[PDB]
Subunit: 201 residues, 6 copies
Amino acid sequence: CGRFLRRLLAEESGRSTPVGRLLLPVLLGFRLVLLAASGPGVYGDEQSEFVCHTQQPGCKAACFDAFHPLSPLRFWVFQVILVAVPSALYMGFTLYHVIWHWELSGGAGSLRLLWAYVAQLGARLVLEGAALGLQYHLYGFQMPSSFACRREPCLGSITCNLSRPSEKTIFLKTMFGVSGFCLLFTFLELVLLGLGRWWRT
Amino acid sequence: CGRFLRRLLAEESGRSTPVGRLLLPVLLGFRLVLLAASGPGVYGDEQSEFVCHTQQPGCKAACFDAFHPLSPLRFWVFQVILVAVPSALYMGFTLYHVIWHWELSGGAGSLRLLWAYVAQLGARLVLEGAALGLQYHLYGFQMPSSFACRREPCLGSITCNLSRPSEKTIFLKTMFGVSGFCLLFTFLELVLLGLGRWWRT
Amino acid sequence: CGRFLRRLLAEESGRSTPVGRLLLPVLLGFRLVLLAASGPGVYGDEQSEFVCHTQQPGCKAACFDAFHPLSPLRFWVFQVILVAVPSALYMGFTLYHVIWHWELSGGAGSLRLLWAYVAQLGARLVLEGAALGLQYHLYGFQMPSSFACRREPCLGSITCNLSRPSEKTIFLKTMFGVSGFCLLFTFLELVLLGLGRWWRT
Amino acid sequence: CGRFLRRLLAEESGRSTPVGRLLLPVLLGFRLVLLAASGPGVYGDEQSEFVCHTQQPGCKAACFDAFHPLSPLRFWVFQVILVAVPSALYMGFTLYHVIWHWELSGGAGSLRLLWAYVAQLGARLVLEGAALGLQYHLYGFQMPSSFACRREPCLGSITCNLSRPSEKTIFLKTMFGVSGFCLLFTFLELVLLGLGRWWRT
Amino acid sequence: CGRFLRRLLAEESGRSTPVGRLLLPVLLGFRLVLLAASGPGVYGDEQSEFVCHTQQPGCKAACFDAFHPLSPLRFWVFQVILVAVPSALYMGFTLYHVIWHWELSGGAGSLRLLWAYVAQLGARLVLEGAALGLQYHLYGFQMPSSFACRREPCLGSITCNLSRPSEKTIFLKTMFGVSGFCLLFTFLELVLLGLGRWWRT
Amino acid sequence: CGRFLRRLLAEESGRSTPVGRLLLPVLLGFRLVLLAASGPGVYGDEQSEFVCHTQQPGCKAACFDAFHPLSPLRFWVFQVILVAVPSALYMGFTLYHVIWHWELSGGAGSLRLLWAYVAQLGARLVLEGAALGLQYHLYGFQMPSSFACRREPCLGSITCNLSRPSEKTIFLKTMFGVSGFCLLFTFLELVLLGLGRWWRT
Ligand SMILES: CCCCCCCCCCC(CCCCCCCCCC)(CO[C@H]1O[C@@H](CO)[C@H](O[C@@H]2O[C@@H](CO)[C@H](O)[C@@H](O)[C@@H]2O)[C@@H](O)[C@@H]1O)CO[C@H]1O[C@@H](CO)[C@H](O[C@@H]2O[C@@H](CO)[C@H](O)[C@@H](O)[C@@H]2O)[C@@H](O)[C@H]1O
Ligand SMILES: CCCCCCCCCCC(CCCCCCCCCC)(CO[C@H]1O[C@@H](CO)[C@H](O[C@@H]2O[C@@H](CO)[C@H](O)[C@@H](O)[C@@H]2O)[C@@H](O)[C@@H]1O)CO[C@H]1O[C@@H](CO)[C@H](O[C@@H]2O[C@@H](CO)[C@H](O)[C@@H](O)[C@@H]2O)[C@@H](O)[C@H]1O
Ligand SMILES: CCCCCCCCCCC(CCCCCCCCCC)(CO[C@H]1O[C@@H](CO)[C@H](O[C@@H]2O[C@@H](CO)[C@H](O)[C@@H](O)[C@@H]2O)[C@@H](O)[C@@H]1O)CO[C@H]1O[C@@H](CO)[C@H](O[C@@H]2O[C@@H](CO)[C@H](O)[C@@H](O)[C@@H]2O)[C@@H](O)[C@H]1O
Ligand SMILES: CCCCCCCCCCC(CCCCCCCCCC)(CO[C@H]1O[C@@H](CO)[C@H](O[C@@H]2O[C@@H](CO)[C@H](O)[C@@H](O)[C@@H]2O)[C@@H](O)[C@@H]1O)CO[C@H]1O[C@@H](CO)[C@H](O[C@@H]2O[C@@H](CO)[C@H](O)[C@@H](O)[C@@H]2O)[C@@H](O)[C@H]1O
Ligand SMILES: CCCCCCCCCCC(CCCCCCCCCC)(CO[C@H]1O[C@@H](CO)[C@H](O[C@@H]2O[C@@H](CO)[C@H](O)[C@@H](O)[C@@H]2O)[C@@H](O)[C@@H]1O)CO[C@H]1O[C@@H](CO)[C@H](O[C@@H]2O[C@@H](CO)[C@H](O)[C@@H](O)[C@@H]2O)[C@@H](O)[C@H]1O
Ligand SMILES: CCCCCCCCCCC(CCCCCCCCCC)(CO[C@H]1O[C@@H](CO)[C@H](O[C@@H]2O[C@@H](CO)[C@H](O)[C@@H](O)[C@@H]2O)[C@@H](O)[C@@H]1O)CO[C@H]1O[C@@H](CO)[C@H](O[C@@H]2O[C@@H](CO)[C@H](O)[C@@H](O)[C@@H]2O)[C@@H](O)[C@H]1O
């Protein structure tokens, strides 16, 4: 499997720039290691870190579900696997293309791989942009220290306190930045292919 | 093992379309990673998240068993391994077929693999459809916030409250959708082989 | 290791039918994945799910040991490793047979492997049948919701309640069925070899 | 690494019988899988399963240390790694012997490996026999349900109760039996080499 | 993949000294194993090891967030992955360079790899120096045993006590030293390449 | 990678005796497996196994930090990775030496590897001896059952009790012995190379 892999890497990346050949794979692996290693330590115990000052039955569960209908740990897991779906389809389409041309040749084919590369960058551009909008819409840029809750079966208005709001705010902003750079260099690799000339006409 | 694997991939998928060659393997791996990474965080602590307002001995255990006789985590594990049984039989039948034709040839054989491919898609079509029916029948499309229980040895009617009903509802619908697309593209790969012509006559 | 493995697979299974070549390995792997993935979630916390209504010292430990002298998780682990012992001896006997005939040949030998295949199916037939009898004898087909205990140092008769009896009953029956099919297809692979002709005379 | 491994297996086991070539490696792997999979579930929580009926400070810790100065989980881990030390020295001595005879030959050497095989079986025979004696001496064949303790700083004599004495007794006897068969087949493989003729004269 | 890897190692390190070829990879792996094996045992339970003498609601969470807005475990994880980003870009740039010169040759190229090696050492020099400054700025060289907190909603001034301040002080200084040696030998490998001659003119 | 590894093993160990070729690698792996498998079970819960008879705030944390400023689990992890640093530098220096002599030769070089082997044994001799001195200095040969503590903010003198002092004493002595044999056979492998002749003159 020495000559095989030396012919797949030169075919999968014979029409890309260094931005899409080196810098994007390293940026996407950075986001994956950071989430797996450090994520559960910050956001793993949100439920026990949510203290409400009351004794009615069912008032804490009603207020925590209004504050966080979805945890950030679940959102970020769905984001990394969605963005990997276009990349996995292009790697498989390239694998089977190399096999059906070793037998005979151990134009119409070389132009077939270029249209597939432009298609997965356009999809990743749409999925990354939509994820950032939901992230700002659901959570924002800061996690508060208190929360007021007027919800049934709570009688009146109660006060609820959170733990570690400074460490959660720092991890939230760090993710927004890594995803922003992934979006920027994906849009840049299209321009260098000639999106500008296609844009005008 | 370079020339061997280059002859098994071209034989196992020399009579399939891109729907069954690229899109289905990526859809089935998506469902497996999502379950392993995110599943236990949502549904792992159902039993401690089920609070009933009483003190009789044995009334909580009676009401939780009426509400959830089977957890969704157990249902989804059985679903992914069943659907993988037809795929594992077809990969082994193809392996031994390549070995018994290398010795001599390093019709009746090529037509033997086509009838085996149609057979595992028909089985997966029946198993996916039956699983969705049980899923809607057992759980539905929403997890409630309260539950009324009139069961022995509880005296009267008691009220029991749940935690995180919004995050559980979102994960339930997300699975129903991924399985629906797996069912759709399995039915589609039969049509493109000629199920329509076989259907009429 | 390409030509080597292509000569071991054709020798280990040159005298077996598809029942013993494809269907049995897939059935035994199914039982192993199901136990590892789902087993601990059902039967992992039996001891804390066993509530007795008393305060004497040592009455709970006396009644739980009378009810479950052995957990199902321990029984099923011993069952899968025992059944794998005859399979591991036959794979090693075949490995060393291929090596001592590559040097010279790169009758008395081909007939040596056939008597070893019949011997491990007979052993697995005896071990699977004995395990099912103990399983029905120890546990049965249903896990109850209550249990009466008259044992020292308990004064009188006490009542003890269990949790999740419906999910434990479903997992118990599912295992009995998978093992039953493993027993059936092991007995069937002997008939197709000629057990009937050997039986009569 | 195809021809290399086909020459090491034929050299490491060209002067052994099937008892030492197939049956002993399978017996030693059986004991290792059983310990790792099932061991912690039985003996992992001994300390919390040891209830003494008192309130003095330090009386429970004094009585548990008199009852179990060493857990069975620690004893069995030391036993499996000690017995593996002679096996690892013989595999390395054989590896370097094959390399220093490929260059030239790609009597005094063949007789060098026979004296090393007899030496590791004699060591394993002494280590297995000593371990069984300590096992019977420390623990016995049964784990009791009660324990009387007259030790300082306990005032008088107190009673302490154990949990799950029936499951611990079954696992203890199962290990004694597997180790007994390992001892038997190690002594048998020496006889078949000619220990009887060496014994007399 | 024998001749391939024998040509990549000689190309990636044909213009480096033993300081950058042996000593730096071993120093960076030392810091990674130490963090993974020993880190969580020291700093994993800071929150439960922070006891404040009060009963007001929300005073403990306010004082722990002022004392530790970021844990050392999170800081050190970000430090090791950042420093690995320049190393991963240089390994990929070297891989694709070897492939595009095997076809033709199975000056302008040899000089292309030298400017890339100087660039990743300069980046690692800036990232290591900035991390040490933040480490001294956030934590210092010692973890105290007490902490005074005048913060809302605490009434007055309260006293809070810490656990294991001696083991945390020892692990903190040990990390500062390993990172200091990584900084020293990175600056030294530039001098031996000729930074002094470039510095003056 | 068959001929490559057959030339590295014969070069890395063409000037060593069986003591440094077989017996030392097996002794160092023994110490690593024993620590990983059995270590956390003995010394993992020291903090909860340290009971002091008082109610003042902060007196338990002050006395446990005086008794154990560093756990044995942390000491032994640092000891095994330090001793592995000289071994990792010598394996890398040998790898690059084999590559720069395959091209030409597929005296000054053979004598270069001998001075590197003597250098890593001298370093390991100094690191093993210093570790044993700290081990006896910090912990000793026995773990007590009680401990008297006169430290602020404790009023007077209090008594604190430990759990499992017999199992901790046995594991401590077992490690001291394995490290002693590693020190002995490292000093012995220098003598057999000719340290005696170098010592006198
Ligand atoms: C590109 C631009 C985007 C444009 C907007 C797009 C809008 C998208 C909708 C956003 C969405 C999450 C869904 C997306 C997650 C997908 C991720 C999938 C990953 C899976 C791996 C968040 O909910 C919205 O609702 C707002 C409140 O109304 C929230 O505002 C905050 O509110 C303040 C409270 O005071 C806060 O104090 C403040 O912080 C904000 O003001 C926001 O979170 C958001 O706007 C919708 O959630 C909805 O889900 C359902 C259950 O499915 C919820 O439960 C249902 O109703 C419950 C009774 O209510 C029952 O109990 C439950 O039984 C029932 O089921 C709903 O209730 C609702 O929550
Ligand atoms: C190369 C030379 C460096 C030159 C200096 C550079 C300055 C860098 C800033 C350092 C920085 C950490 C950020 C860096 C971490 C990046 C790592 C990323 C890794 C991610 C994987 C530490 O905070 C600074 O602030 C000082 C206090 O003011 C602290 O001093 C100590 O204080 C004494 C208390 O009495 C101690 O007793 C004593 O020990 C020290 O005196 C120091 O920690 C430091 O100086 C800034 O933190 C800031 O973050 C934000 C939330 O983002 C915090 O929360 C916000 O405000 C809260 C109300 O306040 C709200 O509640 C919260 O809702 C809101 O959000 C802020 O509050 C603030 O903390
Ligand atoms: C393709 C179309 C499908 C067509 C329908 C097919 C029908 C399939 C039957 C569905 C099935 C699960 C079995 C399938 C799981 C297989 C998965 C295997 C994976 C393994 C890896 C769910 O049970 C049915 O029963 C209904 C209630 O009667 C439930 O309705 C809900 O009820 C409302 C309550 O008020 C809820 O409020 C509301 O939410 C619903 O109204 C539904 O869950 C369902 O209809 C049958 O369960 C049965 O199992 C047995 C124990 O085996 C149970 O325990 C036995 O009886 C106990 C005393 O009772 C004893 O204590 C126990 O000792 C004894 O043993 C039974 O009791 C029964 O539960
Ligand atoms: C092919 C056809 C099979 C033909 C039958 C073959 C008979 C096989 C014997 C079955 C066997 C398990 C052993 C097999 C497990 C091997 C698996 C190895 C895997 C290891 C990886 C189950 O015990 C039998 O005994 C019966 C009770 O007498 C049980 O009936 C139930 O009882 C009702 C109670 O009221 C239930 O309510 C109801 O549910 C049933 O009526 C059944 O479980 C069974 O019949 C024997 O167990 C025995 O083990 C010993 C300790 O070794 C036990 O402890 C000893 O005595 C204690 C004082 O007693 C002391 O405290 C203890 O200190 C001492 O040591 C014994 O006590 C005894 O239990
Ligand atoms: C080759 C021959 C060796 C020759 C001797 C060499 C001497 C080496 C010094 C040994 C050393 C460990 C350091 C080595 C570990 C490196 C391992 C690195 C691995 C990392 C992966 C043990 O401390 C010494 O001190 C003695 C006490 O003074 C101890 O004796 C025992 O005491 C009896 C009590 O009554 C016992 O009852 C009895 O059992 C013994 O009598 C012994 O442990 C030892 O002698 C020094 O520890 C020092 O560390 C610092 C924090 O860094 C400690 O904290 C500082 O002060 C605190 C207020 O005090 C503050 O609270 C804290 O905030 C502050 O920071 C110090 O306090 C001090 O402890
Ligand atoms: C081939 C034939 C064998 C021939 C016999 C050879 C004899 C071998 C000695 C056996 C040995 C274990 C050591 C072997 C483990 C090596 C495994 C290594 C694996 C490591 C990976 C078990 O101890 C012996 O002592 C007996 C009691 O005296 C025990 O009997 C039982 O007692 C009844 C009580 O009433 C029971 O009710 C009943 O069940 C039995 O009657 C038996 O366990 C045994 O005979 C010796 O243990 C000794 O260790 C030391 C600490 O090192 C212990 O602690 C020391 O003293 C404490 C004050 O005492 C202090 O508190 C402590 O601070 C101090 O340190 C000692 O106390 C002592 O225990």
